[PDB]
Amino acid sequence: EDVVWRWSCDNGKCVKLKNDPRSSEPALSLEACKMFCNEYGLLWPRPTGEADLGNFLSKINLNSIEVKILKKGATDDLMEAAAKRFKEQVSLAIPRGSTPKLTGKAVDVYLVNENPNEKAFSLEMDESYGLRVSPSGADRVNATITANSFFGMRHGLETLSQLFVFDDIRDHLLMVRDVNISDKPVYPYRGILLDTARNYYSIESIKRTIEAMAAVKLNTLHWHITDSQSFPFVTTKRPNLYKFGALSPQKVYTKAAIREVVRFGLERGVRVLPEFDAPAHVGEGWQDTDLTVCFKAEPWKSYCVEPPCGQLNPTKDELYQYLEDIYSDMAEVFDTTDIFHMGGDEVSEACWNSSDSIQNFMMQNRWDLDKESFLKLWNYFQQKAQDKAYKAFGKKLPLILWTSTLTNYKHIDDYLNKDDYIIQVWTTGVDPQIKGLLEKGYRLIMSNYDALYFDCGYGAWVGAGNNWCSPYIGWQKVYDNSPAVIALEHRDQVLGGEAALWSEQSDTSTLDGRLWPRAAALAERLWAEPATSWQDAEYRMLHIRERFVRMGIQAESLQPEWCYQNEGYCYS
Numbered sequence: 001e002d003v004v005w006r007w008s009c010d011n012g013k014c015v016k017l018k019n020d021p022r023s024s025e026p027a028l029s030l031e032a033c034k035m036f037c038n039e040y041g042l043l044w045p046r047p048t049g050e051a052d053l054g055n056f057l058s059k060i061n062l063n064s065i066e067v068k069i070l071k072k073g074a075t076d077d078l079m080e081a082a083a084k085r086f087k088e089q090v091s092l093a094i095p096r097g098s099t100p101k102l103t104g105k106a107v108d109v110y111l112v113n114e115n116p117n118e119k120a121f122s123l124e125m126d127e128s129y130g131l132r133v134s135p136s137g138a139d140r141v142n143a144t145i146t147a148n149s150f151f152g153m154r155h156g157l158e159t160l161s162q163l164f165v166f167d168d169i170r171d172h173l174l175m176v177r178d179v180n181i182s183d184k185p186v187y188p189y190r191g192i193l194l195d196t197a198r199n200y201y202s203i204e205s206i207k208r209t210i211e212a213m214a215a216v217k218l219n220t221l222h223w224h225i226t227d228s229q230s231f232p233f234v235t236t237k238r239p240n241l242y243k244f245g246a247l248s249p250q251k252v253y254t255k256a257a258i259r260e261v262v263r264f265g266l267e268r269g270v271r272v273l274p275e276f277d278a279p280a281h282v283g284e285g286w287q288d289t290d291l292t293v294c295f296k297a298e299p300w301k302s303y304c305v306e307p308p309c310g311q312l313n314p315t316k317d318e319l320y321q322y323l324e325d326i327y328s329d330m331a332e333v334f335d336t337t338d339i340f341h342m343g344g345d346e347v348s349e350a351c352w353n354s355s356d357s358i359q360n361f362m363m364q365n366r367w368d369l370d371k372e373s374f375l376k377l378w379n380y381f382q383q384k385a386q387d388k389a390y391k392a393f394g395k396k397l398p399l400i401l402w403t404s405t406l407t408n409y410k411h412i413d414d415y416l417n418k419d420d421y422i423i424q425v426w427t428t429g430v431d432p433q434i435k436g437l438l439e440k441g442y443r444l445i446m447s448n449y450d451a452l453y454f455d456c457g458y459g460a461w462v463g464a465g466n467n468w469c470s471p472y473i474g475w476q477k478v479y480d481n482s483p484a485v486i487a488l489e490h491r492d493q494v495l496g497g498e499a500a501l502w503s504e505q506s507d508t509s510t511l512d513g514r515l516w517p518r519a520a521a522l523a524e525r526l527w528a529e530p531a532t533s534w535q536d537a538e539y540r541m542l543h544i545r546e547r548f549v550r551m552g553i554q555a556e557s558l559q560p561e562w563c564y565q566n567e568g569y570c571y572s
């Protein structure tokens with residue numbers, strides 16, 4: 001049938017009223033009411049500069065949307081793809097099974113990229129843009145996006161596509177008539193860590209993730225591609241690793257597939273940042289190489305944080321020839337990344353100390369068999385690994401390592417330095433380590449486990465009960481988590497944050513629900529850094545969830561749809 005209700009703004013809330021036929025007032029559809037009742041309308045994330053949306057809408061012909069690229073250059077392929085992608089984005093305003101009337105004005109999208117040759121990712125890349133929308137004569141609209149690079153430009157296309165609403169009362173596609181927007185992100189690094197080694201994730205599900213990331217302007221996919229449980233990364237120079245390491249022959253990431261993903265990400269302003277976690281978090285794949293110790297060691301609680309146990313043996317020269325080859329194979333297909341993640345997850349002294357060859361190496365070099373000695377072995381490893389990474393990427397590039405014993409601020413400067421190493425932080429924001437690190441000039445990527453671990457809250461995968469970092473982190477807690485509050489003065493040293501999806505209990509099937517719409521909360525926090533909290537973003541978060549679902553993302557449900565149609569009535 002046809003929609004029977006209407007909506008009217010009242011103290012910032014769209015109230016549902018009956019659409020009585022005996023009225024001279026034009027009825028508002030739910031989202032038409034929302035676009036103007038809300039401070040920032042249906043925008044996610046909300047802009048950092050000007051947010052002038054005006055007061056009116058305009059009927060639009062869907063078939064009469066034409067995009068024109070004004071400045072041409074090296075990024076022609078990228079801009080043409082992003083423009084072709086724009087028409088499809090506009091259709092996301094329309095609910096499936098509803099068709100818009102083919103009438104209304106024509107839309108002219110004018111893309112001006114003022115440095116059409118820049119297409120490299122860097123922490124200094126300019127992702128700012130300007131958005132102007134105004135009527136053009138009688139039967140058309142002037143939509144102009146102006147930005148310093150392609151990245152800001154496609155960010156602007158994203159924001160522009162959010163200015164379309166569907167009127168399901170009349171079946172009209174509408175657009176905001178007069179907009180003036182200036183925008184740019186607060187943090188340069190906005191990411192998701194996807195663990196694809198504890199469980200496999202189809203290429204299609206990964207592209208689908210990147211698609212959703214772009215929709216809320218997140219720019220980094222950190223691809224945790226290897227661990228102790230599997231080695232799906234197809235390494236040509238050391239094919240024995242993925243042949244023995246993969247969960248199955250089909251559960252693998254080939255050079256062609258990775259290139260597809262990397263290119264797909266580039267077209268969408270997403271840096272695909274590969275990680276090889278070492279010298280811990282290794283196992284499957286390294287059988288019969290004699291380059292690991294403690295693999296499947298029992299009882300596992302004595303040797304590692306989670307089974308199977310396994311670490312690299314740094315005392316063997318051949319290890320670094322394997323490492324160089326792995327890095328080189330990564331550098332070849334991950335060819336948009338400006339950064340490389342080397343893991344640095346906590347090493348087990350117990351494991352290294354159980355090895356004959358390792359103990360002899362430490363005695364014959366005078367070191368002892370104490371915690372400080374094994375910290376030297378780790379430094380010894382990381383220094384040589386680092387050297388090979390540089391040779392592999394054919395240049396020096398920033399490296400990322402987790403907060404660990406090795407990166408304790410008290411002694412991190414012994415072999416690490418703040419110009420070469422970025423530190424990813426899992427510890428809670430009130431930990432002394434963050435302050436100690438910030439003061440020694442180190443840059444941070446925030447991934448604090450109490451706000452940013454998207455795996456928390458489920459059943460136990462060893463034993464019974466729940467998983468280690470329960471309870472489940474609602475989007476509210478991730479939205480409110482602010483690096484600016486954590487960093488304080490040293491906040492420019494914070495590069496941004498990363499939602500971490502560890503995959504002991506997540507794979508292809510649970511991917512959508514794990515990330516969305518929670519990652520959108522991180523998206524707004526890192527793009528805008530609001531002084532306002534989650535309550536002020538609630539209505540817009542509900543809408544962005546619906547947009548994800550319309551995109552085909554199987555996003556988590558936050559609230560009854562009733563709350564979305566009846567703002568103000570669901571509260572606590």
Ligand SMILES: Cc1nnc(CNCCN2C(=O)c3cccc4cccc(c34)C2=O)s1
Nearest residue numbers: 305306345346402426449461462467468469
């Ligand atoms: C990177 C990093 N990601 N997470 C980090 C912190 N490690 C948390 C420690 N931990 C636990 O403290 C733990 C307690 C009880 C059961 C458990 C089952 C599996 C795994 C764990 C675990 C576990 O990993 S560092």
Ligand SMILES: *[C@@H]1O[C@H](CO)[C@@H](O)[C@H](O)[C@H]1NC(C)=O
Nearest residue numbers: 110132133134136142143144
């Ligand atoms: C469209 O709008 C921009 C910004 O107001 C303006 O500078 C430009 O000249 C307009 N383009 C056309 C062809 O109307």
Ligand SMILES: *[C@@H]1O[C@H](CO)[C@@H](O)[C@H](O)[C@H]1NC(C)=O
Nearest residue numbers: 349350353354369370371374
């Ligand atoms: C390593 O093992 C030796 C005995 O084999 C012991 O003396 C030493 O304390 C151990 N090191 C650590 C850190 O446990």
